[PDB]
Amino acid sequence: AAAAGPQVFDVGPRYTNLSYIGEGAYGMVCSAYDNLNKVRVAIKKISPFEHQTYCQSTLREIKILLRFRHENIIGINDIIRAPTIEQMKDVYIVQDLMETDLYKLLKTQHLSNDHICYFLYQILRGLKYIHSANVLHRDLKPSNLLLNTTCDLKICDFGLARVADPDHDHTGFLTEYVATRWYRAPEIMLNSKGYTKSIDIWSVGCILAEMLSNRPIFPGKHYLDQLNHILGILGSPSQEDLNCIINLKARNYLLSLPHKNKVPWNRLFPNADSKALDLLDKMLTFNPHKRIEVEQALAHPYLEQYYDPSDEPIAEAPFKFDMELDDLPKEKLKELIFEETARFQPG
Numbered sequence: 066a067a068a069a070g071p072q073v074f075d076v077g078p079r080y081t082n083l084s085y086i087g088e089g090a091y092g093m094v095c096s097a098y099d100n101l102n103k104v105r106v107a108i109k110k111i112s113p114f115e116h117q118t119y120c121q122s123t124l125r126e127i128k129i130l131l132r133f134r135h136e137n138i139i140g141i142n143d144i145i146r147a148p149t150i151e152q153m154k155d156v157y158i159v160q161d162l163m164e165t166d167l168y169k170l171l172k173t174q175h176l177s178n179d180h181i182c183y184f185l186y187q188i189l190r191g192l193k194y195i196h197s198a199n200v201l202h203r204d205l206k207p208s209n210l211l212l213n214t215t216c217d218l219k220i221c222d223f224g225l226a227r228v229a230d231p232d233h234d235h236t237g238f239l240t241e242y243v244a245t246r247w248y249r250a251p252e253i254m255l256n257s258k259g260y261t262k263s264i265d266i267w268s269v270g271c272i273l274a275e276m277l278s279n280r281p282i283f284p285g286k287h288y289l290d291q292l293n294h295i296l297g298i299l300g301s302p303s304q305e306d307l308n309c310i311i312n313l314k315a316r317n318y319l320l321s322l323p324h325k326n327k328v329p330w331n332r333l334f335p336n337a338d339s340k341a342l343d344l345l346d347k348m349l350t351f352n353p354h355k356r357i358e359v360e361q362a363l364a365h366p367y368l369e370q371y372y373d374p375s376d377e378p379i380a381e382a383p384f385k386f387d388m389e390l391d392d393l394p395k396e397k398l399k400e401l402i403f404e405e406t407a408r409f410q411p412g
């Protein structure tokens with residue numbers, strides 16, 4: 066009994082006065098007035114129950130976001146659903162209302178170096194917590210970074226997040242992958258399933274570049290073009306880095322390419338702070354084993370104004386899934402979603 070651009074947005078009497086914000090992957094996002102806490106909030110309507118992939122993403126995000134507690138990671142304030150599994154068609158996730166996201170901001174606004182530095186700090190601060198829980202976000206990009214009017218930044222969208230599993234990271238050349246193309250590390254196309262923390266650091270490096278110029282640094286038009294873009298800037302990998310790739314097919318593909326020299330960062334970003342470019346270089350390192358880790362990045366001179374490891378908290382314990390969600394049907398995932406959201410029922 067409350068409508069927005071039809072569909073139904075029925076968020077009990079607690080939340081009223083809706084306004085469209087945008088379209089999520091599984092439904093509408095609206096702002097609403099929270100009559101209890103007397104502030105406006107964001108509410109995401111999720112109708113995932115007709116697809117198993119949607120159910121997986123929904124369950125991951127709920128389980129992770131309820132477990133995590135950090136200033137730079139969006140929290141779940143409330144979840145609204147029907148009182149029984151039979152009656153539950155949609156789920157509504159309530160969060161703090163953020164003003165915008167970095168994707169929307171970068172369309173029209175140039176960032177000062179101070180804004181770049183602070184936003185990077187907050188990304189990495191949140192990421193340290195996520196990594197400390199042994200979790201990989203796996204889809205870091207501007208539209209998954211929420212911003213408010215006072216420049217607070219919160220990472221959102223944990224629908225592709227997994228527990229880190231470096232021992233099972235290896236795969237064949239040109240193995241298909243799910244997360245957003247432009248932000249994919251080179252090894253994803255070569256030999257990696259994206260089960261190590263280094264894949265997130267690559268994504269942050271792409272985000273830093275994009276903050277510096279207001280355009281994606283590696284805008285590949287398709288799967289293999291993405292690697293072409295990356296190599297066009299970094300240049301040909303060294304022999305040492307090629308020897309680290311044991312995958313014959315991936316190694317021979319790289320050996321087949323003409324030599325390319327590195328494009329210097331200060332040619333690409335002539336107005337950028339030199340320390341920012343030095344950190345960028347270390348995040349956008351081809352060899353994932355040599356790539357900077359989150360705690361080192363925080364300690365980099367670029368971020369010296371903000372660095373304080375005692376104020377960069379970690380998770381109280383590693384995160385673990387009870388069961389593997391990929392092997393679970395539509396219906397069992399619905400069941401788990403119901404149980405995970407039970408704490409918010411008057412009940």
Ligand SMILES: [Mg+2]
Pocket residue numbers: 208209221222
């Ligand atoms: Mg998103």
